[PDB]
Amino acid sequence: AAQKSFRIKQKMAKAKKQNRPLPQWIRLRTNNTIRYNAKRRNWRRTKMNI
Amino acid sequence: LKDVVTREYTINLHKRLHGVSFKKRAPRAVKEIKKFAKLHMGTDDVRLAPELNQAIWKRGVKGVEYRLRLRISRKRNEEEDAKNPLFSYVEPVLVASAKGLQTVVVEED
Amino acid sequence: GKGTPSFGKRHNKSHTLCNRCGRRSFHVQKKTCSSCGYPAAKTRSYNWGAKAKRRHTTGTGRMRYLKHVSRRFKNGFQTGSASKA
Amino acid sequence: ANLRTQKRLAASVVGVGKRKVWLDPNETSEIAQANSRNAIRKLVKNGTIVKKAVTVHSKSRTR
RNA sequence: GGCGAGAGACCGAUAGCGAACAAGUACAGUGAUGGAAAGAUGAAAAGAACUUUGAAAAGAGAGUGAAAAAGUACGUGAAAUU
RNA sequence: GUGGAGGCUCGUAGCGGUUCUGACGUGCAAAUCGAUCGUCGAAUUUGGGUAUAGGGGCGAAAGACUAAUCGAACCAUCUAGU
RNA sequence: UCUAGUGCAGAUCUUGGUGGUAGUAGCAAAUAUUCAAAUGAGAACUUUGAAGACUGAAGUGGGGAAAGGUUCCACGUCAACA
RNA sequence: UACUGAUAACCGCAGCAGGUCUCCAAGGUGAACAGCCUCUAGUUGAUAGAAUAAUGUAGAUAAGGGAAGUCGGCAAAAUAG
RNA sequence: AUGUACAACGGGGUAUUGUAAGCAGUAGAGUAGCCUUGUUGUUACGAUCUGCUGAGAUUAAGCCUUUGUUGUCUGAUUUGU
Lengths: 50, 109, 85, 63
Known about the structure:
This is part of a larger assembly, with chains A (50 residues), B (109 residues), C (85 residues) and D (63 residues). In chain A, 0% of the residues are buried. Chain A has helices spanning 6-18, 24-28. Helix content of chain A is 36%, strand content 0%. Chain B is of the alpha+beta class and 109 residues long. Helices cover 27% and strands 28% of the residues of chain B. Chain B contains 3 helices and 5 strands, in the order βααβαβββ. Chain B has a 5-stranded mixed sheet. Chain B is globular and about 40 Å long. Chain B starts with 5 loop residues before the first strand and ends with a strand. Chain D has 63 residues and is mainly alpha-helical. Helices cover 41% and strands 6% of the residues of chain D. Chain D has 3 helices and 2 strands; from the N terminus they run αβααβ. The chains hardly touch. The structure holds 5 RNA strands.
C-alpha cells in the first residue's frame, strides 16, 4: 500500500527491474538456447506473494 | 448518371414507425430516411445533416414527429471515387407546420 | 457464503517475510517462521521433510567459503606466497 | 487523432470538468501539437477552447 | 552424504535422479508443503540480396545450400483427425 | 398541560435471509439475481489488534464452526499400509 | 549361443494428442443511442463537435485504510489479450 | 508519499451481476441523506443489425362469477399517507 | 419495360377522442389601487366559464378513394426433348 515498508519497496524495485524482455544480442550469441524470457511477471496475472 | 438536382419531400414517420419499440423509434427514423432517399433517388450513399438528426431527436426517442419536410440534394461525388458517382444529402426545412404540403423540385440558386 | 464472498473478505496477511529464509512464512502473532524456525537458534528441519532439506540445504547457495575449503585442503592449508621462478 | 489528455488538462486548468470543456475540431492539429498546460492556456487565450455556458437550473417555479 | 578418480551385458528425453535445457525453476497454496513441461536446422547462417502484388503480415519469383521433400511454426516426420 | 422512558412499535440505510419451494441451474455466481419478508438504538452491526490448535479449541448447542475441508482439519512420513 | 525392465484392444489405466457433437448451445441483467467531420489501408465501438439519455449528493462524484505493485504520465504501436 | 480502492487495478483460477472499512453530501416534491425529477462532477461502458412464430422469463389487463382451484387462498389482487 | 402502371405526397371520405391555439367578452368567487370620487369609475390579480369551435389533432402502418403534384420502370444468374 501507500504506507509501506522499505523491504516491500526494495523487492518491488527489484521486480520492476526484472520485468522486461530479453536482449536481442543475447539472442544472437553463440551456442545460445534462449529464445525468450520465462521469468516474466505481470501484475494482472501473477502476484509476488510478499 | 444525370440529375444533380434538389427536391423537397414530405415523409410520414408515423406510419413508418407504427409498432416500434420506444428505444428505437428515432434510429429507425434515421434508417427509414436513408431508405426513403434510396427509393426516391436510387442512391446508396446518403448523408444526413446533424440539423436533421437533432430535428428527429428533438422530442426525444419516442416523441418523433408524425411528419417531416425534407430537402434532398442528389449530388455528384468526389473523394477517391466509390461504387457510385452520386449520393444524397438530406437536410431539414424549418417550417411552421408541415401538413398540407406536396413535394416540389428545387434548383441551384 | 462460506466460499466466494468470504474469499472477498480475505485481505489480511497472517504471514510475512522472514529475515533468515526469505520465504513469507513469518507468522506475526506468534513471531515464528514456519520454515526455518526463526527466531530460534536452530534451523527447522525434519527427516520426513526430505524434499524440504534438499531444498534448503548446503549447495543451493553460493558456498562463499566452502568450495575454497576443499581447494585449500588440496594445497594443504598453506600460508605465504609464490617466489617468481 | 486523440485529444483525451488535452481535454483533461484543459478541465484542470480552467477549473471545470471535461463535460464543460469544448475543443473545436477545426483546430484539431493545433490542439494535438499542444501537449503542455502552458500551450493549453495560450489556446484558451486565443479562444480555441472555451470554458462553457453553464447548464441552467432555475427556481422560478419554486419561488 | 562430502571431495576427487575409474568403470558397466544399466536408461536412453512419457525411459533414467523430480531436474540431459535459465529445475527444486516457472507455477499453486495463508502456511507447512506441493512441484511441472521443455533436447536435435544445417558441415558452415551461407538465416533468404534484388524485383513484383499487398496497408502490412505474407505470397509469387530470384538466390544460398548437397538438400528448403532442411526456412528458427526448422533432423526424419507415423496414426487418430483433415 | 409539561416531560420524553422503553432489550416499545412503524419504517430507511445497515444486519439478515421467510416465501415465491420464482429466475439461473454445463449460471454472473462451486450458493448468485429479482421481488416478497424479519429486525433496525439494542443480548446491535462492524474494522484493526489480541488469545484460544486437532481427540484439541470455540460453541445463546445445529454435532455447528475451526481457510470452498469436520460424527475429529490440513501437510509430510510410517506407506508401494492390509 | 547368452541375457532381460522382452510382444497389449481393453485396466471409469497413465501422459500427450485428436475428433463427431458443431459453425451448434450460445455471446439477452444493470432504461440508449444517433448525425457529421478527422485520422487510418480499414471505423457500429478510437478522437472531436452537435443532439438525446442516465447515475441524481445513502451518486456511475470527489478523497483514503487493508490489499495490489508502477496499473500512474507520455511517445510509438496492434502478432497475442480486451 | 505516485495510482486504483473497485460491475476492469484487492480476493474469488478471469476484465466474474458476488464480497470488502470509511469521510464530504445541492434544489424541488414530500414527515424524510425514502421513491421521482434536476444542477456541479462523472459516464454514455455491457457484441451488433433485420424480423416480431411457437415456447419461455420479467411485467400488465380482462366481462359474469368470486377459491368452485389447490395439500394448503401458493401466487397476485385489494388495503395503504 | 411507358400505362383505368406503381409508388411517395396532397386532397376528399370513413373512423377515434371530445370543442385546439389565439383573440375577445358589461361572465366570474372575490381582493387591492386610483382619482374626476364615482352615481357600472376604471386599472391590476384571479380557479374557471362563454363565442369564434361536434372544433382542432390523428386517420394505415395489414381502412376506402383519387380528373391533382413529384418521381420511377433493361441489374445479376441459370436452364434444352
